[PDB]
Amino acid sequence: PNHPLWYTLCDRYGLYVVDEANIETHGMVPMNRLTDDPRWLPAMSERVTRMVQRDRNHPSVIIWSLGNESGHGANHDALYRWIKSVDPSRPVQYEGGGADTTATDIICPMYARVDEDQPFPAVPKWSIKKWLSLPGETRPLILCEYAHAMGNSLGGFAKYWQAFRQYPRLQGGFVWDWVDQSLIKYDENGNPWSAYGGDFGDTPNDRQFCM
């Protein structure tokens, strides 16, 4: 959840908002180790429920998200249903556990390609065109993350937009991402420069991957 003024500005300037719970357990092995554990349901529940209680009156918020990169655990299904029950006005989405689980109203993959399948075990990223028509599948597809804009990037961006326009159920996506997470450091003369991972003696680090 963002600083509260963000939603005010989105209401007034006009931007659709996905409001997302502060839950990410990416570094767990497997990713859902905590989110499938009932011991962690109370902590997770508050991050979902208290977001809804705060932001439910903002017209800019159109979709609730259960968090990010926390696998798919039973705690997600419980909290999916909680939101559906208290606020039927907004779809609920969540990418973890393969982007098309029982905890999401929207097929919301990250970095699924337009034409190319990436058939990873358990959590495949199908071609978005292919994903829509998998047997029994009927949901809209909106990428929660796509076109990773790291350094000299956005090659193939047009391929996404051609597909979005041709396919009714491909309803777009959210580019990753808006702004480089670089930080200002200063040389001996006080001149500023842009710093990334490892520049603060921080270790281990992931270097330029924050930009």
Partner 1 sequence: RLAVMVLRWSDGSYLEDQDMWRMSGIFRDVSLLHKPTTQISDFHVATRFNDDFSRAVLEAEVQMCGELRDYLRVTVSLWQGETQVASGTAPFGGEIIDERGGYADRVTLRLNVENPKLWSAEIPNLYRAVVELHTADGTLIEAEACDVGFREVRIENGLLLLNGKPLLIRGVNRHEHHPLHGQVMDEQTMVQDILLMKQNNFNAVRCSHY
By annotation, the residues acting in catalysis are 69, 145
The structure tokens listed for 126 are 């199908």
Task: Take residue 16 and report the two structure tokens written for it.
Answer: 């659709």
Task: Tell whether residue 72 is among the known ligand binding residues.
Answer: no
CA distance 12 to 14: 6
58 is in an annotated binding site: no
Query: Would you count residue 157 as binding Na ion (CB under 5 A)?
Result: no
132 binds partner 1 (CB under 8 A): no
Nearer to partner 1, 106 or 132 (CB): 132
Euclidean distance between CA atoms 21 and 56, whole angstroms: 13
Q: C-beta of 180: minimal distance to Na ion in Å?
A: 10
E strand residue ranges, 53-188: 61-65, 92-93, 141-146, 170-175, 183-186
68 is in an annotated binding site: no
Minimum distance from residue 63 beta carbon to Na ion (Å): 17
Pairing of strands 141-146, 170-175: parallel
Site for partner 1 (CB under 8 A): which residue of 14, 42, 135, 155? 135
Contact call for residue 170 and Na ion (CB under 5 A): yes
Q: Choose which of 88, 136, 155, 190 interacts with partner 1 (CB under 8 A).
A: 136
| 146 in a labelled binding site | yes
Q: Is 20 annotated as a binding residue?
A: no
Nearest to 196 by CA among 177, 209, 187, 178: 209
State how far the alpha carbon of 176 is from the alpha carbons of 25, 33, 45, 154, in Å: 19, 26, 27, 10
Q: Which does 136 bind (CB under 5 to 8 A by kind): partner 1, Na ion, none?
A: partner 1
- Report the C-alpha dihedral over residues 71, 55, 210, 34, rounded to 10 degrees: -20
Query: Which member of 16, 186, 193, 209 binds Na ion (CB under 5 A)?
Result: 209
In the complex with partner 1, the residue whose CB is nearer, 135 or 151, is 135
- Dihedral sign computed on CA atoms, order 159, 147, 174, 9: negative
Report, in Å, the least distance between residue 14 CB and Na ion.
21
Binding residues for Na ion (CB under 5 A) = 164, 170, 209
Binding-site entries for substrate: 69, 145-148
Binding residues for partner 1 (CB under 8 A) = 133, 135-136
